[PDB]
C-alpha cells in the first residue's frame, strides 16, 4: 500500500539503510516469524504414512505462501555497505568494505596475512 | 517435486470452471506438472512476454507447462 512497501510494518535496521537491504531484512523477519509453520507444512507434505489428501493440502498451502516466507530467498548483504557479492559471514561485510575495516582496526582480531 | 516420491508438482488453477465451460486457463506457473485431470483443457501459458495458447496434449501428461512455451526467439545471423 502507500504507507509501507511490504504488508507488515517492520523496523528499519540501524546504520546503513538501502532499498535492497530493506527488502532483505523484511524477508528475514517474515521467515523468522513463520519458520515453525513452514517446517510443519513441509513435514505434512513429505509423509508416506499420513493421508494423501492432507499432504496434498499442505503442499498447496506451501505453494501459496508468499515471497517473504521463503528461506531460500534470503541473501547475505554487506551490513556496512549494501553490496551482495563476496559477503564474508564472519564479519557481515563485502570484500572491499571488509578490507577497509580490517586495515583501520574495526575488526576484533583481523590483521595483515603475512605468513 | 521431481523425485517420484512426493510427486507431482501441483499448483492451484481455475480447472473445474474450465472443465464445465471452455474458458482457457491463463497460467503464469510454467513449473506445474501436467496431470491426467487436465487433458483437453485449453491453457494460455506465460512466455515472459505474451501468453501462449495450448490445448494440453494427451502425451504431455508427464511434462511441465513451461516446456511448451519457448521463451527465447529462434536465433539468426544478419549476414552483413
Amino acid at each position: 500500500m502507500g504507507n509501507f512497501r511490504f504488508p507488515i510494518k517492520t523496523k528499519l535496521p540501524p546504520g546503513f539503510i538501502n532499498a535492497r537491504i530493506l527488502r532483505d531484512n523484511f524477508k528475514r523477519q517474515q521467515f523468522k516469524e513463520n519458520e515453525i509453520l513452514v517446517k510443519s507444512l513441509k513435514f505434512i507434505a513429505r509423509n508416506m504414512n499420513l493421508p494423501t489428501k492432507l499432504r496434498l493440502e499442505a503442499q498447496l498451502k506451501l505453494n501459496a505462501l508468499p515471497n517473504y516466507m521463503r528461506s531460500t530467498q534470503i541473501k547475505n548483504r554487506c551490513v556496512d555497505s549494501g553490496h551482495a557479492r563476496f559477503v564474508l559471514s564472519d564479519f557481515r561485510l563485502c570484500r572491499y568494505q571488509f578490507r577497509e575495516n580490517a586495515l583501520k582496526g574495526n575488526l576484533p582480531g583481523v590483521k595483515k596475512g603475512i605468513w | 517435486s521431481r523425485s517420484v516420491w512426493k510427486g507431482p508438482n501441483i499448483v492451484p488453477l481455475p480447472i473445474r470452471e474450465a472443465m464445465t465451460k471452455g474458458t482457457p486457463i491463463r497460467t503464469n506457473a510454467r513449473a506445474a506438472t501436467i496431470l491426467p485431470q487436465f487433458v483437453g483443457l485449453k491453457f494460455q501459458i506465460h512466455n515472459g512476454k505474451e501468453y501462449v495458447p495450448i490445448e494440453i496434449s494427451e502425451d504431455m501428461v508427464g511434462h511441465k507447462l513451461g516446456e511448451f512455451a519457448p521463451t527465447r526467439k529462434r536465433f539468426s545471423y544478419t549476414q552483413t
Binding site: - | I15, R16, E17
Partner: peptide, 28 residues
C-alpha cells in the same frame, strides 16, 4: 503412453476428490 507412464509412477499416491482439492478458481 505418457499418461500410462504417469499412472504407473504416481500409483502409490492414487493422484473427483483430488480435482476438488486442487482447483481454486479465484486466481486466473
Amino acid at each position: 503412453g505418457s499418461l500410462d507412464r504417469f499412472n504407473k509412477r504416481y500409483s502409490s499416491l492414487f493422484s473427483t476428490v483430488e480435482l476438488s482439492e486442487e482447483n481454486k478458481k479465484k486466481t486466473q
